């Protein structure tokens, strides 16, 4: 049983293709187009073309879910207008097997994410930015019961306007300190120099002390939580978890990110469904503007439900897989009504 | 007869399009805007207003995009259902179908001229007074949990934060002057359980409280003073953007044409980017026309070139 | 009234499928156009309609040239189609339906284009069902208002896409009346279709269109006497 | 092998379309399902075949019940379906396109999957066009070479949608001899199809459909004069 499965899987992955081709050069064009309402005297056409295009990866990896659904529509219908899906059924070849197949086709565009997502997108993103805007200043952090204020931090490892305030259990000032310039040493510790101190005034030439930052996450501050590779992500919130506490935001994004591939076949499972159930003796062109609406709207919800997520004091993995589940689950009863 | 039916088609899918459209492109601003909110940048409870005085913006947009997408998809469905056929077997042709369609054109011409040169400045200007009011947020309602945000010389940081923007928690205040306390409620802010410090100066308090252009203006002012490009532009853009309507109509019943197989639906793709086509022309005859580049002039040709380029296609 | 058509011919994709069809049509005269199935019969149909713009040949109605004008254009000289599939109005009323196609012509008033409508629902017998919607009325009376609709453009010469098709054995017999009616009347009837066998029991005369071009012509009996048209289309045994 | 269907029942748009309808089939036998167009021959042969989900009725192939399964264990239980309009893999090779359906089946290995291949390509004559696209082949040799997939399964019975529509007088005979061969192969052939004419010089027996029920059943003959079918359906002449 591999002849079949060959053809449903070359003919929606040609699909899927031909749909990521098309939509990244559209996406492409429309934000030049948007982007070219904020040109300046340095910022030229020519250099909002060249941003464009650096974004292009993240574009491409913003699209791939909808690209899928799309793909295994066009594919779907192109194998039923055919009358093909009847025959495959008449000789005993079950809906979950094309569905399978189809889902085949579609974990390349997921692995294509992931290389998107971890290798890629953090390193055209930043020659983007680079490009629009031609390593962080007055960076307020927490260490527990320490709140620690640097006006300049260089990823080299440098620190220039340090200000410490320790405080006690009870929120008593325990001591408070200030520095000119600051270098890390090791793990977790800093000398620095010209050590202004008082304690529950003070002076010192160089000294070293203990203090969480790492030039390792430095640059990250600056980066949107989105934005961020899993790795990244996923360092990052250790790191704050450990010595601070996460902000939600970045667990919205780390929920968002981990929900991308089960979004993407959930999307292509209801696309199936969809070719099977109502869009059924359909004309192409109403399964494309079916597919375009359900992709509309999940992209909808999925960033109205985040913004929920944030507003709203339960955890954002709820707002997060439950239209992942709540389709699955749609999907797998449209395709058990046959 | 005909006349009335192809009016009472065109109309109730052409709202049927415009009321789907409306709902798709605010309900994305909405949810924008929602997201914003959600950073503190924006009071949740006015950004309905915000839609409210967008929609003539948006609907100038949408009304002939949609009628033009209403067009396609009646012709389509004459097309499709084969009522084509017989029309034309009865001598009346597709060019005079789109005729008999001329007196819902000027009514939709009129309206769109009714929301480009009164609904629209109107819009934009309360939405620009509302913005202007809404950006002077500052401290406290900008303070997100778990975060620290900076504005001037003030530094807040919370650990939680209700669903509305009060009663906030493990608050931490900066300028010189340091404030701590356990609790806080929304600049006169209420401080319970909270400690002052100087930087020497302490206290103590159980109870504190801190004290921390041109496409708005009315046409009636622009309809004069052309030698101005910025207003020669603008106002070049509200007395020669309803004319959309006839270009879409006409470029509509161009490109109508579909067979059974094929669908209803099947030429929406091509002939929605070729509209698209002519309002980026628009959008960018203006930039010009602004800076003093192109005159005037340009509005009207560029719907020639699309009106003339329709004519033709249809008589081919 | 005489309608010649002469020397067709029409390609796709390279591929030369009518070459040098041609025939000729009177009012009050049935004419069928049979032959295999995607040999031409079909083309040559639609190339006659307008629906398929024409690649060569010339068609003639009485010394008036037909060759350039588009559809409606022909339509306007009296050339009426009735296509295989539904095509009532959905959403409009019968007599509405009718009424339409009353009203575009420029040598009636509102009286008598009233008494035309009621000659015409009577005619077909479809006046009990008059104000019903298109969409809700049997496969029959569907077809009967179309020929009425078609009939009110007050047509010469109607041209039938496949009228037998879907019809059981009882109503072969209505429409073949129906047709016979429209002879009648004075309208040259041009029916193609599937069914050889229920076409050639009405046809006055017939033309067989194989390889793409006309292979046989005359009377039914001389159609079926014919030795190639039995070799190639009907078979060793037919009636 | 019989099949038998019992009380089949559809509705459309709270109308019923099917009302008790019934009858039965065996291998070896040729099984005509006619009636006016729209009547419910249409509906009930799609209701056997499992297209349309069935309101009432039940279906039994030798004591084992077909009612609740869907349309891939129906034909997985035997009984195969040849649409009426087109639906070879356009985009596969003819010889492809019967070893995809043949690779399906769990009793064969790849020597005689191969044998059997041959032996479908010399039967339907279609051998000389095997390294063809099925989108480029000519009417008769696509319904051929989708008659020999159909076969590449095993169906124990055949329902057929509307074989003779579109096919001229000359091509009849073939596509009668090709349903008999099916017949001469043992298996049950229920023919669906608006040609009456046709459908009754070859079908060894014949159920008619009006208003929703079976009407009229038994030998061509014993249709031909029967009265109610005459008067409803076939017409005083025939
Ligand atoms: C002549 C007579 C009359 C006729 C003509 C009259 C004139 C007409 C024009 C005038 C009236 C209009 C009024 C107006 O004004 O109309 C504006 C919007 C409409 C303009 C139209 C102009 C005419 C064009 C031609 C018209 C005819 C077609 C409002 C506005 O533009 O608002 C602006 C808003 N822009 C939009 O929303 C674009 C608009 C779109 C328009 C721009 C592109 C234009 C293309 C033209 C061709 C279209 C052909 C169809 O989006 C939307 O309409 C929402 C979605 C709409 C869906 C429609 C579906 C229809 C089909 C339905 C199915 C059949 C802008 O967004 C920024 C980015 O945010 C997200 O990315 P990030 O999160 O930041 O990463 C978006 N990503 C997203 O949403 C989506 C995400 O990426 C996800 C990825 C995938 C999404 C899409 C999937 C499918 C893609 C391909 C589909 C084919 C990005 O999307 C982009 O980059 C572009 C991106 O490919 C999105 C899609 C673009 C194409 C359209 C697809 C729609 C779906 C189709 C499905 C079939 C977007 O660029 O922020 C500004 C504020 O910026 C500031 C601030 O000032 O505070 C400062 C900034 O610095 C920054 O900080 C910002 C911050 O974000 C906080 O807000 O804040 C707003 O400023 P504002 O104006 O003050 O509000
Ligand atoms: C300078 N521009 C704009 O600010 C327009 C008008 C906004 C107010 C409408 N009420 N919006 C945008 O850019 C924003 C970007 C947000 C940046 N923060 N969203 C995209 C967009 C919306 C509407 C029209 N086009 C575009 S994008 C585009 C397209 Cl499609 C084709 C060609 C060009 Cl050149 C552009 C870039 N844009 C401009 O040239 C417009 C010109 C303009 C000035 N006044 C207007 C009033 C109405 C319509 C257009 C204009």
């Given at each position: 049983r591999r002849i079949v499965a060959k053809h449903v899987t070359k003919t929606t992955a040609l699909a899927m293709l031909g749909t990521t081709i098309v939509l990244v050069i559209l996406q492409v064009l429309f934000t030049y187009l948007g982007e070219l309402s904020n040109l300046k005297a340095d910022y030229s056409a020519w250099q909002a073309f060249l941003y464009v295009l650096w974004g292009a990866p993240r574009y491409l990896y913003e699209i791939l879910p909808i690209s899928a659904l799309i793909g295994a529509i066009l594919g779907l219908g192109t194998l039923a207008s055919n009358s093909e899906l009847i025959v495959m059924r008449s000789v005993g070849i079950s809906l979950w097997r094309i569905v399978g197949w189809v889902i085949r086709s579609a974990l390349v565009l997921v692995l294509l994410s992931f290389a998107l997502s971890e290798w890629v997108v953090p390193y055209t993103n930043e020659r983007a930015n680079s490009v629009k805007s031609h390593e962080v200043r007055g960076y307020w952090s927490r260490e527990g019961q320490r709140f620690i204020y640097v006006d300049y931090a260089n990823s080299q490892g440098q620190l220039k306007r340090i200000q410490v305030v320790d405080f006690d259990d009870?929120?008593?000032?325990?001591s408070v300190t200030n520095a000119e310039q600051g270098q890390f040493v090791k793990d977790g510790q800093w000398l620095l120099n010209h050590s202004q101190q008082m304690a529950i005034l003070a002076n010192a030439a160089k000294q070293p002390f203990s203090l969480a930052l790492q030039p390792k996450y430095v640059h990250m501050v600056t980066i949107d939580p989105e934005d961020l590779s899993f790795s990244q992500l996923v360092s990052f919130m250790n790191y704050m978890r450990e010595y601070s506490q996460v902000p939600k935001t970045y667990q919205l994004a780390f929920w968002k990110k981990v929900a991308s591939p089960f979004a993407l076949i959930t999307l292509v499972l209801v696309a199936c469904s969809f070719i099977f159930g109502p869009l059924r003796q359909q004309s192409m062109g109403f399964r494309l503007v079916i597919a375009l609406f359900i992709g509309l709207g999940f992209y909808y919800l999925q960033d109205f439900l985040g913004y929920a997520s944030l507003v709203?004091?339960?955890?954002?993995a709820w707002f997060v897989l439950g239209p992942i589940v709540l389709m699955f689950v749609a999907g797998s009863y449209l395709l058990y009504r046959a | 007869i005909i006349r009335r039916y192809l009016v009472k088609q065109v109309v109730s899918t052409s709202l049927v399009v415009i009321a789907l459209l409306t709902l798709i492109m605010m309900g994305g601003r909405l949810i924008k805007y929602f997201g914003v909110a959600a950073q503190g940048r924006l009071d949740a409870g006015v950004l309905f207003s915000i839609i409210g005085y967008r929609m003539p913006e948006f609907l100038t947009l949408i009304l002939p995009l949609g009628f033009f997408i209403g067009l396609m998809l009646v012709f389509g469905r004459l097309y499709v259902d084969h009522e084509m056929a017989v029309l034309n077997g009865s001598g009346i042709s597709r060019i005079r179908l789109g005729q008999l369609l001329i007196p819902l054109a000027l009514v939709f011409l009129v309206i769109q001229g009714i929301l480009m040169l009164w609904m629209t400045p109107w819009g934009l200007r309360q939405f620009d007074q509302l913005s202007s009011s809404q950006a002077v947020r500052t401290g406290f309602d900008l303070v997100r949990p778990k975060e620290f945000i900076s504005s001037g010389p003030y530094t807040i940081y919370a650990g939680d934060l209700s669903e509305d923007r009060k009663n906030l928690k493990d608050i931490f205040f900066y300028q010189d002057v340091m404030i701590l306390a356990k609790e806080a409620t929304r600049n006169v802010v209420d401080l319970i359980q909270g400690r002052r410090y100087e930087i020497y100066s302490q206290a103590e308090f159980q109870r504190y409280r801190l004290r921390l252009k041109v496409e708005a203006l009315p046409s009636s002012k622009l309809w004069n003073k052309w030698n101005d490009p910025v207003i020669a532009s603008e106002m070049g853009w509200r007395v020669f953007g309803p004319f959309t309507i006839v270009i879409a109509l006409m470029m509509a019943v161009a490109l109508c044409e579909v067979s059974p197989r094929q669908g209803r639906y099947y030429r929406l793709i091509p002939a929605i980017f070729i509209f698209a086509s002519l309002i980026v022309l628009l959008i960018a005859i203006r930039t010009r026309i602004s800076r003093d580049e192109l005159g005037v002039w340009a509005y009207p040709a560029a719907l020639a070139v699309y009106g003339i380029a329709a004519a033709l296609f249809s008589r081919k | 009234q005489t309608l010649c058509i002469k020397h067709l011919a029409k390609n796709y994709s390279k591929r030369w499928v009518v070459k040098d069809v041609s025939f000729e049509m009177q009012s009050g005269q049935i004419v069928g156009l049979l032959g295999p199935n995607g040999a031409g019969k079909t083309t040559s149909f639609y190339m006659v309609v307008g629906l398929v713009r024409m690649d060569k040949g010339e068609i003639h109605l009485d010394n008036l040239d037909l060759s350039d004008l588009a559809m409606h254009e022909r339509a306007r000289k009296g050339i009426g189609y009735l296509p295989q599939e539904a095509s009532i109005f959905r959403k409009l009323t019968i007599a509405e339906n009718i009424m339409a196609i009353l009203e575009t012509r420029k040598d009636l008033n509102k009286q008598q284009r009233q008494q035309r409508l009621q000659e015409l629902l009577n005619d077909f017998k479809i006046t009990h069902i008059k104000d019903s919607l298109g969409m809700s009325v049997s496969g029959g009376e569907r077809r009967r208002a179309e020929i009425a609709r078609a009939l009110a453009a007050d047509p010469k010469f109607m041209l039938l896409d496949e009228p037998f098709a879907g019809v059981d054995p009882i109503s072969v017999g209505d429409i073949k009346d129906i047709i016979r009616n429209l002879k009648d009347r004075g309208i040259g009837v041009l029916i193609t279709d599937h069914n050889v066998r229920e076409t050639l029991a009405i046809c006055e005369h017939a033309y067989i269109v194989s390889e793409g071009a006309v292979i046989a012509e005359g009377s039914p009996q001389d159609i079926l006497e014919n030795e190639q048209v039995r070799k190639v289309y009907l078979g060793d045994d037919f009636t």
């Open positions: 009870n929120y008593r000032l325990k709203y004091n339960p955890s954002p | - | -």
